[model samples]
Target: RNDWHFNIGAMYEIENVDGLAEPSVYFNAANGPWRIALAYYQEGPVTWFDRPELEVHYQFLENDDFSFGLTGGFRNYGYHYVDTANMQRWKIAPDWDVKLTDDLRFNGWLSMYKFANDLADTRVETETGLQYTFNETVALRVNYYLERGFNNNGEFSTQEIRAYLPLTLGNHSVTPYTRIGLDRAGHDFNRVGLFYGYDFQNGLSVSLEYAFEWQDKFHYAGVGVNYSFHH
Candidate 1:
């Protein structure tokens, strides 16, 4: 089997009564057990395009239940409030997916990041989740993430919990999700979001989403489109 996929996304953030936009694009292709992925990501209103971040990921052991991958990326900021610099990191992550039945599945991944800078040079991120399908029209998922950074602002850590429910409507879908997050700095926040998507028969898909931050009452909207080719 051979496959190719591409995704493009745009977002508008409402920050301090000002609106800022960000854009991203991703591409991936696979042949047999060899897969490669590339992505372009940029954010911020004034310096977003100064130097976009580029990422390259390669993976082996491509199968239905297990995968191991290495990811490396770099970002260069020509102008910054603090200083102009380059930030780069690389990591290896092993991921697993298990299907207990036709309607239930479990998936998880653990990643370790190493940066060139000593101030924020090391971090570990872990994610685990389970999904259950109630029927053809509905599914539910719950996920948890633990992220810790070392030597970065004096050791930073965060815990996040998320729940999502998706409903299928023929060629369209709707999902509503909620998240609760807590940081080591004694801050907590709750967020809720809704996502809508539609699939076209000709290998094109589109999605739109809006989210609300309960703690700060901030809102943002996102849009994405993608295309797939299969052989």
Candidate 2:
């Protein structure tokens, strides 16, 4: 079947009884690789059903000496509803994850989103990452993201950077990360986060995370937990 791989699953959401469904299908043929997916669900008073995305990725050139590639996709959010109001959206993303060497990885993507009735601007977002691995369980990643929305009135912009490392012990692993965010839309923006995860001998593990958000005189702190099949 041309080396195809797929995954399908469902989840029960807490905020609403919106039963979630997600399925992903992909295949790599002699020419290139292709992927398709569908997501339908409800989260915190929002509901969407039968939304789908299609992606195509290709390797135009590959050699031990040099390499390059391309990727593209389309997404539809027609069945989306927020606060009992329809939120229609369509988006296209073009991207690539390039490897210049065995240990150096470069990745980037650019996406543009359009909403119905000119209610929202065409949103554009881009992010790039460079990673280096020191060993099997230790690697560092540095990345940056730039996002902006443009309309008849003006534009809004936000940027951020992140760095992190991975640690592994026996069957358990953890990652400690840090990031900084900036907004040029006449507001102060800053945030800090720490997350810890563990694995057990049984099919159970726990994760805890906390974050502090600051904007001008407004500030908030958040904490969360997760227990799942991680052993």
Candidate 3:
């Protein structure tokens, strides 16, 4: 069909921080590889953080098979230490996925961050990954994360690597992922996550995710659910 298609999506995510809020959006596009998206997110009585921030992201990909693209956008940041004041960042990032034959893939991303206000510091981050797929039902992935902090904050400088795999069952997709982080030459567990999702034939989809993030020795759990539609 030559006609245009549009979609609306929503997500409910909860961490130890805020209670719950629904992030929703709708998207439509013309003939170009570009689309206009509108998204809204609400805050749930938080001790710190910004509420009802509008977000926009524009992405351009040269190829779709492996997701080699560039992105420029502004979005909210609410992390405890990095974004204590609930700031927004303007970011320009480039990502590439390299294909090694038919079953193996490699991906990487690098970006520079610019904060909205002077209270927050600008930073840079990069992630490189490798993947090996066995047929269509299973795959193994390895990823590395590197981050640098500005303004003499040594705590935010770190490196991380992760290895994960996905187990597919019919319309349901599940992936168990794990990571290790290194700061000051010391290695620690960073995060472990399980991704679950389902796709329907009626232009509707659902995704549920759970994760456990660790500090030097502290850990916490998070849960998130998302629903998407296409028409």
Candidate 4:
């Protein structure tokens, strides 16, 4: 048997902002300890499709209980996927996972955000979380996010806690999630969303998602489809 796999996926999102749509696509291939992905995206419907990212990830060590890996990527970094609209950044990160128990696991990734411009400096960000699964279809994930400026800064500029409840029933699945933003003002710290997906046996799947932002009183809707080879 060959331990190789590949997938291509794309998504398009619509928001209350007039005439706003963001669509993105990516291709990924992985085998054993190595994986490569190429992606391009648009941000806030302002830019075209010029934001590109190339990622290479490799696992240096692994075992029954633990695994460690490093990810290197070069990205245009203008998409602002991480909730901030600052300058561009180059990500240098190391990620790891540990199986704490039969149905429980702990994982996290710490990244050094090297700013592409001198004036903005650099930052450090990390997400540490726990995942619990049972009964084949019910699972929960909770994560803490923190981002500090200047790498050695005294205070973290952003802090948030996120939670997700993802359930699967046969070929159908749905996820309900939320974010608790600690430092966000104007009541913008609250968010809730529901995502649904249906998978077809023929390597195809369709997805839909809807979300709301409390402070801005905004709505978001998205639709997407993906096809994979050698599932």
Candidate 5:
């Protein structure tokens, strides 16, 4: 079989700040030890869809237990308050995935952020996650995030921890997730989400997600659809 994959999806999110309509597409092809992937997306309201993000990734190793990859990306934002407002950023990330057992895996990635026109200082970010498959129908994952960067103010550090539990029932899947920001200035126990997805035999899938935050009583609801083809 050819090692080619394509994905396209659209999402509508309801939020307090502003509603967003995001359309995304991804394509990837792999042959032996070399693989390349590209993704693009537009996010905003109905009339405001210029905000774009593009990413390119190359993998150097593909094995049963270990693999390495490099990613380069740029994101254009629409915010007007901070330096990132109407600005763009270029980032380079290196990542790896390793399987410890048949049911356990580890993934880690680090990226450096550089903005255009001295908009912001360079930042280094790291993410590590562990996933454990309890059975064919259930799995759990935990992730840790850390970033060091300088803003318009000064240098700062941020950290967060997130976890998710997914359960598969027949052709349906459900996931419950939580995220807690760490550090003295971050949220104590703030974010949670629930996701439900259904898959049809015709390679079509639909998903709905609800997210909430504690501080501002933030709420978001999103709906998305995807289709897959196997050759």
Candidate 6:
């Protein structure tokens, strides 16, 4: 299974976030160590879900315990909704995974993000966590996320403890998760969510998801269907 030659998938999501009904579709393809992703999202003052972003990725180092790569792309944010935000983003990170014993695993990624906007500073982020499997069908993941904003924004850092419990059996999976946000730099927010998905042996899958953000009082629910192929 590790020798995936080529694969492609498309996923569609429809939800109502805050006051806007957001709908989007994601197309993803992978050829060996190279990856390509394209997305079309809803928004803007008068535009439909025609807004899009294109990104590409390549894996420069692909060892068993370490994976390093670069991803960059121009986002459509400057053209629609948030007119002043970053119009493009480029990022890279080192991802490492190791087994802590039998059923517990440690995984981490320390990454950097740079956007096209000069006024907004660069970002350094890290997600370090442990995933412990209780049994064949149940597992829990606890991750600590830290985000450091560069000299541009004096507001400083953001930190959060994110956790999720995933129950999976065969081709069916259900996960419930929560984000515990630290009230730092006015980033006082929390989120709760649940997701369900099922996969068919014929390269097809379906999923349902719901999420709520307490601070913004934003909530959304959506159903997504995906088809994937190995070529």
Instruction: Candidate 4: list runs displaced more than 4 Å.
Output: 17-19, 44-49, 61-64, 77-88, 118-120, 151-156, 184-188
What global local distance difference test value does model 3 have? 0.65
Query: Which structure is stronger by lDDT: 5 or 6?
Result: 5
Off by over 4 Å in 6: 1-18, 44-51, 59-76, 81-86, 117-120, 152-155, 186-188
Candidate 2 residues 34-92, lDDT tens each?
Answer: 44444453333225544445555665666544445555555544444543344456666
Identify the leading candidate in terms of TM-score.
4
Q: What C-alpha lDDT do the candidate models reach, one value each?
A: 0.69, 0.55, 0.65, 0.79, 0.76, 0.72
Top candidate (lDDT): 4
- Residues 1-231, candidate 1: write the lDDT tens digits: 445444443333333335556566666665544455555656575243343455556665556555455555555444454356555566656666677778888877778877665214588888789989899899998889888888614577888888889999888889999888866456888888999988997778888888887655777677777777766
Candidate 3: the clashing residue pairs are 6-231
- Where is model 2 more than 4 Å wrong at Cα? 10-32, 45-84, 100-102, 118-120, 167-173, 194-212, 216-231
Q: State the TM-score for model 3.
A: 0.74
Candidate that beats the other on TM-score, 1 or 6, i.e. the better one: 1
Which one wins by TM-score: 3 or 5? 5
Candidate no. 4 TM-score: 0.82
Report the lDDT of model 6 for residue 144.
93
lDDT by residue (1-231, candidate 3, tens digit) is 554446666666665533444344434343345445555554443333433333333445556365565666676756444236556777777878877768888888888887775346678988888888888799998888888877734435788887788988798889888877766356565778888888785667777877777763333333333343433
Which of candidates 4 and 6 is the stronger one according to TM-score?
A: 4
Q: Every model's Cα RMSD, please?
A: 3.5, 7.0, 4.5, 4.7, 3.7, 4.0
The number of residue pairs in model 1 that clash at the backbone is: 0
Candidate 4 deviation (Cα RMSD):
4.7
Residue 19 local lDDT, model 4: 48
The alpha-carbon root-mean-square deviation between model 3 and the true structure, to one decimal in Å, is 4.5
Shift of residue 150 alpha carbon in model 4, Å: 2.4
